[PDB]
Write a protein that binds this ligand. Structure first.
Ligand SMILES: CCCCCCCCCCCC(=O)SCCNC(=O)CCNC(=O)[C@H](O)C(C)(C)COP(=O)(O)O
Ligand code: SF4
Ligand code: SF4
Ligand code: FES
Ligand SMILES: [Zn+2]
Lengths: 94, 185, 62, 140, 385, 165, 69, 65, 10, 112
């Protein structure tokens, strides 16, 4: 699959590249990317109102909330950093 | 009788080299075959006892400019005896001639002429393949995606020439295309 | 009085006195026959204009 | 017991003898399906339903009983099916499509999107038992 | 033999009919109909319109049977959308489809009789035609091109007195049919001008793609309302008339019986019509109430999006056919996932019937060609889109 | 068959007994009330939902209801509406040009049911045949005149379908 | 260019010598969605339009006014 | 205009008549135009147009108020 | 969608 | 009668081109009588017109494209043989027919 909008991910080095499961699909992203950006790499486009790629992150609108296995409450994907082995869920009822 | 039975029976009985794509769903059981096996497939499906398809509902073309084989020809079929419908599709570009089925279904002549008129697909062994719908001397095939909606020529009466003449088109108000597509689709 | 344009006709209707800080304008006595509901904040000195009707609302006391 | 007065269909005429024409057509179909390869799906189905219909036409003399047991149209709609099957067998023999290619591949799409109940859907009644018996014969 | 031309420009026979007849003596040896005089590019114009915007195009296809085409288009859209229709809307759609069938049958029978030469039944039938067009003019705002049946449910609800007035109509339509039948059925001239004219066998009807009265006149009991039932047609009791000889007289008798059965279905629909809402509750596909759009934010958003972009049909393709008064009317709708149809073929029953005029008329008198043309109930709005 | 049946059906063949039965029906309809109407004097029945000549409505204060949202122009299946808009002197969103092609109009009522402010309506008028083509190119002034001339009937009709729309 | 399909298509020879631009339209700046991306379009550069001197409507004489859009 | 009731009078002088129907109707809502110079075929105001075409049961004098 | 692809499978 | 099967080589395409050209040549006398072209055009100017059309479409090397061109030409010939097309149409198509081009185009309009 291809990133949303043909976005180009620049890997500075192949060593620093974590792996996440956006919807059961293996995605390789650099250390520092957020859950929203990792979803953008995996072709999934998360709703957003307050997040702009050219502006600082401010999780106000709470519209990009997703599900994470090791989380009791939904996380703001725009501000949550991506961790290795993290399983994101976007289309779930939560 | 039903989509669940026809699918399995045609999977077993039909020769394998004819059909190359079989969809079984509620929208319709389709068969996709090469253009050189279409006539054989329809003759088989018209004469077999458990697949007595004796009515050809219509023949239509679909234009896909992004494909190598641009045009998709669809044969909607009906079996009155078993109360079932079968759809058979092939693919052809602008310069290949596909086999005609007027021999099996006599009604296929007018839909084949309409397909040739609208898309430019020619049929082998058609008794008379001439345009059926467009005006006499019409140039171009309107139902193609690259054909402009209003066409290329316009018709008006010329008083000095004392006849109805054809002129290049010139709209007093152009067609306004409204782009309603959403980025969140 | 066809010489009066609708702008001049709507500029002659005196503003409606409202006691509260906010008023809801529907455009007609029967809600279903007017325009979509419009809530207008009366926290200024000039009369507040409805963006559908053109009617002006001004706060009554303060 | 009496001869059929009318078939109820324009163009289709009552055949005074239907147990004598159907038996011959089924015998010809069974004798001419031999040239098709044994392990082909067409031959098994054609040699199954033709065998049953031939037998059924053999036991019972009257056409009413034949119509009842087969339960699939009139005998005048069975004679035309037998003749069409003979024609199809001939066309299969001359075309010879039995050769399975080495590079053959087929995409079997299975869509399950539901459709509403009020939408027109073709819902036939259950088929006669041979339409299934031939099916398990083909699967096996 | 010489070459003959019937172009009747006057609508005393269709209006855009163009037959090129090869006559040996008084017989005709071949009939070649030249179509395309009413080809307005409807199929291509559909691809440039929204699914809602393309609905009125189907009113003008078979302009004697308006509701039949809208019903088929709506059913195709619902099939591609998996949209459930409320029971009251289904009953209304069936009721108006049967009213449309009665209207089409009346116009066909009496326009055919006028071509033969019977002037009286034409106006007698158009009186009842006016009475039924009144019912169309009440529920919608148009006498003929009523965009009433819509993909979600139906456009809007019924006025108060419609059921009572339709019942009053049905109290006397039986006697109207009886008088029209008394004018023509027993008459010896009418029998002599139709009996053994235009005979078609069942095999010919199946091969040439005949449907409806053309197919059922040959003995084939094939009704799409009983073979592939839609809406609430499986909850209503009605018979399917079947011919015996296939001539033009059987077609006329079946056209009488079908209209009587449509009266029966109308009565049942009136008696059994339930209460409830007339559209799908999924407002993502149907317009909100005018009181809700002016009071709720989400209703206003839905109204705006529906009346600018419309709904988007998921990428698929299907063929849906209904039992139009002429025969089997089918719509082959292809969707690419956008708000506009990618392709929409209209399968007109009149196309396959006018194609078969060549073999029905062969070795017939010249004066029998008009009867052969009129018994098929052909309108050229659908023949050439 | 029976001699009686042969005699009975031979008499009916010769005495034209199935044509007298049609003559009697036609004659009985001769002495009957007519159903034709004097069109100039009496008009045929209509419905409050009737879709006739278009009209642009205005508020009772004298302000036009049209807010230049162009929602009727986007739904028009015939592309018969052209709207030009700008900010008025008061800052209100109003139309400068609002013209409808009555030669493209198909009188479907989509514009009437898409207007969120009930500005554009199809009045009960159906007698507006013109002698010239460009008299059928209605503009904002013509539509507003239609709305002012048919205001009471349009208001009564819109009141009638308040219970349905 | 092997414009044989252009010759057997029916397009007039005048319109077969047009110069077109093949491009992929980009995302609009007023929306953050990226749904209308990845599709390629042919721009015929159809700019020859004027104003109707009766009602102000936009007139054109170019058949490829909106085909590519 | 015989055995009929005059419903009301118009500003142009047009007179509106009504007759009672039982089962088939006919000549129950018509106008006697005050002019005879070809009558222009369209002289009914908006308040009387609805009553004439059976759109509304209000006469037109009541529609004014 | 279950778009599995068949093969000669010897 | 039926549409011929698609060709397999350029020789068959050339043979069909020659056959169609001969058919058009035999069709010349009929047009001179159906339309009053007697005192209008010489019987060889039309022949040269068809020859010129064939020659200016003679750079095609695809047999399928040649077959489609022949089919379209045959359809046009059959239409002209019938009274379908108007008289001036064939006369409008089938008749054989100073500073700089750029400067004249510049004086005409900005859109070349
Ligand atoms: C009134 C009559 C109505 C109809 C008139 C006709 C209207 C349509 C005219 C046909 C239009 C076409 O392009 S149809 C004909 C188009 N087909 C070709 O041009 C084949 C490619 N040409 C060659 O191979 C050679 O140059 C060749 C010229 C054969 C000879 O040269 P040699 O042998 O040395 O090789
Ligand atoms: S009635 Fe229909 S066609 Fe006419 S302007 Fe309104 S939307 Fe357009
Ligand atoms: S008439 Fe209504 S829908 Fe049309 S622009 Fe004006 S307010 Fe909008
Ligand atoms: S985009 Fe607003 S919370 Fe993340
Ligand atoms: Zn307001």
């Amino acid at each position: 699959r291809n990133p949303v909008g043909g976005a180009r991910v620049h890997f500075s080095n192949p060593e620093d590249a974590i792996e996440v499961f956006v919807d059961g699909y293996a995605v390789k992203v650099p250390k520092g990317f957020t859950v929203l950006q990792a979803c953008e790499v995996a072709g999934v486009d998360i709703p957003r109102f307050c997040y702009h790629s050219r502006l600082s992150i401010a999780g106000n609108c709470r519209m990009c909330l997703v599900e994470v296995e090791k989380s009791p409450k939904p996380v703001a994907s725009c501000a949550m950093p991506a961790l290795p082995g993290m399983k994101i869920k976007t289309d779930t009822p939560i | 009788m039903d989509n669940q039975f026809i699918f399995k029976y045609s999977w077993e009985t039909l020769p394998k080299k004819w059909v190359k794509k079989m969809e079984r769903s509620e929208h319709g059981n389709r068969f996709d075959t090469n253009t050189d096996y279409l006539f054989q497939l329809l003759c088989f499906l018209k004469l077999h006892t458990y697949t007595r398809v004796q009515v050809l509902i219509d023949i239509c073309g679909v234009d896909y400019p992004s494909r190598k084989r641009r045009f998709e020809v669809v044969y909607n079929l009906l079996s009155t005896r078993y109360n079932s419908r079968i759809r058979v599709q092939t693919s052809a570009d602008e310069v290949t001639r596909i086999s005609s089925v007027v021999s099996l279904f006599p009604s296929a002549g007018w839909w084949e002429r309409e397909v040739w008129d609208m898309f430019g697909v020619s049929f082998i062994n058609h008794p008379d393949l001439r345009r059926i719908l467009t005006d006499y001397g019409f140039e171009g095939h309107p139902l193609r995606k690259d054909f402009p909606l209003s066409g290329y020529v316009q018709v008006r009466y010329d008083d000095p020439e004392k006849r109805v003449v054809s002129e290049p088109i010139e709209m007093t108000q152009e067609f306004r295309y409204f782009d309603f597509a959403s980025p969140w689709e | 009085r066809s010489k009066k344009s609708p702008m001049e006709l709507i500029s002659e209707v005196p503003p409606i006195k409202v006691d509260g800080r906010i008023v809801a304008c529907e455009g007609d006595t029967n809600p279903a026959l007017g325009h979509p509901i419009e809530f207008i904040c009366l926290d200024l000195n000039e009369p507040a204009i409805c963006k559908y009707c053109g009617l002006r609302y001004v706060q009554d006391h303060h | 017991a009496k001869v059929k007065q009318t078939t109820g269909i324009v163009g289709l005429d009552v055949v005074p003898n239907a147990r004598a024409v159907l038996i011959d057509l089924y015998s010809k179909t069974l004798k001419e399906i031999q040239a098709v390869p044994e392990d082909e799906g067409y031959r098994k189905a054609v040699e199954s339903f033709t065998r049953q219909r031939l037998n059924v036409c053999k036991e019972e003399e009257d056409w009413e009983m034949i119509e009842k047991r087969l339960g699939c149209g009139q005998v005048e709609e069975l004679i035309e099916e037998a003749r069409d099957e003979l024609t199809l067998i001939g066309k299969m023999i001359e075309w010879d499509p039995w050769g399975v290619p080495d590079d053959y591949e087929c995409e079997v799409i299975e869509n399950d999107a539901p459709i509403p109940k009020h939408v027109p859907q073709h819902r036939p009644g259950p088929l006669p038992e041979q339409f299934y018996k031939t099916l398990e014969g083909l699967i096996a | 033999n010489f070459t003959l031309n019937f172009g009747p420009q006057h609508p005393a026979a269709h209006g855009v009919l163009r037959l090129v007849l090869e006559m040996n003596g008084e017989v005709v040896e071949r009939a070649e109909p030249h179509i395309g005089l009413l080809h307005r590019g409807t199929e291509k114009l559909i691809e440039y319109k929204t699914y809602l915007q393309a609905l009125p195009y189907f009113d003008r296809l078979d302009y004697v049977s308006m509701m039949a085409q809208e019903h088929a288009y709506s059913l195709a859209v619902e099939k591609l959308l998996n949209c459930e229709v409320p029971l009251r809307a289904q009953y209304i759609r069936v009721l108006f489809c049967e009213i449309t069938r009665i209207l089409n049958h009346l116009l066909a029978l009496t326009t055919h009789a006028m071509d033969v030469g019977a002037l009286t039944p034409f106006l007698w039938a158009f009186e009842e035609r006016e009475k039924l067009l009144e019912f169309y003019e009440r529920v919608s705002g148009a006498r003929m091109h009523a965009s009433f049946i819509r993909p979600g449910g139906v456009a809007q609800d019924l006025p108060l007195g419609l059921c009572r007035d339709i019942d009053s109509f049905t109290q006397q339509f039986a006697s109207r049919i009886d008088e029209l039948e008394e004018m023509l059925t027993g008459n010896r001239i009418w029998k002599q001008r139709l009996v053994d004219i235009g005979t078609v066998t069942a095999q010919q009807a199946k091969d040439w793609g005949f449907s409806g009265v053309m197919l059922r006149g040959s003995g084939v009991c094939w009704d799409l309302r009983r073979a592939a039932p839609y809406d609430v047609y499986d909850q209503l009791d009605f018979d399917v008339p079947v011919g015996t000889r296939g001539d033009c007289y059987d077609r006329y008798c079946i056209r009488i019986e079908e209209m009587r059965q449509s009266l029966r279905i109308i009565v049942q629909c009136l008696n059994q019509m339930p209460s409830g809402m007339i559209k799908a509750d999924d407002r993502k596909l149907c317009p909100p109430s005018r009181c809700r759009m002016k009071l709720s934010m989400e209703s206003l958003i839905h109204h705006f999006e529906l009346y600018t972009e419309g709904f988007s049909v998921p990428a698929s393709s299907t063929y849906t056919a209904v039992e139009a008064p002429k025969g089997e009317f089918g719509v082959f709708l292809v969707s690419n996932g956008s708000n506009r149809p990618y392709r929409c073929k209209i399968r007109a029953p009149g196309f396959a019937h006018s194609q078969g005029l060549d073999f029905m008329s062969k070795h017939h008198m010249l004066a029998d060609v008009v009867t052969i043309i009129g018994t098929q109930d052909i309108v050229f709005g659908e023949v050439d889109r | 068959k029976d001699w009686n049946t042969v005699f009975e059906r031979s008499i009916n063949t010769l005495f034209l007994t199935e044509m007298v039965r049609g003559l009697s029906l036609t004659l009985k309809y001769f002495f009957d009330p007519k159903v034709t109407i004097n069109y100039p004097f009496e008009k045929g029945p209509l419905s409050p939902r009737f879709r006739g000549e278009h009209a642009l409505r205005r508020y009772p204060t004298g302000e036009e209801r049209c807010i230049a949202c162009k929602l009727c122009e986007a739904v028009c299946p015939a592309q018969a509406i052209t709207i030009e808009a700008e900010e008025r002197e008061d800052g209100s969103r109003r139309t400068t040009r609002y013209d409808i092609d009555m030669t493209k109009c198909i009188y479907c009522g989509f514009c009437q049911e898409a207007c969120p402010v009930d500005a554009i309506v199809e009045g009960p008028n159906f007698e507006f045949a013109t002698e010239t083509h460009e008299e059928l190119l209605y503009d904002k002034e013509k539509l507003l005149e239609n709305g002012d001339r048919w205001e009471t009937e349009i208001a009564e009709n819109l009141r009638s379908e308040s219970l349905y729309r | 260019k092997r414009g044989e399909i252009g010759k057997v298509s029916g397009i007039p020879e005048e319109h077969l010598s047009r110069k077109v631009i093949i491009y992929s339209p980009a995302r609009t700046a007023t929306q953050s969605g990226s749904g209308k991306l990845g599709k390629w379009k042919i721009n015929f550069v159809s700019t020859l339009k004027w104003e109707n001197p009766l009602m102000g409507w936009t007139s054109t004489g170019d058949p490829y006014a909106n085909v590519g859009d | 205009n015989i055995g009929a009731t005059l419903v009301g009078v118009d500003k142009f002088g047009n007179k509106y008549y009504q007759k009672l129907g039982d089962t088939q109707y006919g000549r129950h809502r018509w106008v006697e135009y005050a002019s005879k110079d070809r009558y222009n075929a369209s002289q009914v105001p908006a308040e009387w147009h609805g009553w004439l075409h059976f759109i509304t049961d209000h006469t037109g004098d009541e529609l004014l108020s | 969608i279950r778009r599995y692809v068949l093969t000669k499978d010897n | 009668i039926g549409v011929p099967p698609n060709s397999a080589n350029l020789t068959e395409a050339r043979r069909r081109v020659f056959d169609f050209f001969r058919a058009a040549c035999r069709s010349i006398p009929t047009i001179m009588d159906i339309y009053n072209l007697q005192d209008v055009v010489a019987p060889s100017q039309l022949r040269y017109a068809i020859s010129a059309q064939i020659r200016n479409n003679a750079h095609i090397t695809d047999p399928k494209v040649i077959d489609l061109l022949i089919f379209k030409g045959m359809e046009e010939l059959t239409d002209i043989v019938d009274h379908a097309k108007q008289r001036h149409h064939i006369i409008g198509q089938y008749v054989v027919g100073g500073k700089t081009d750029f400067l004249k185009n510049f004086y005409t309009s900005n859109y070349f």
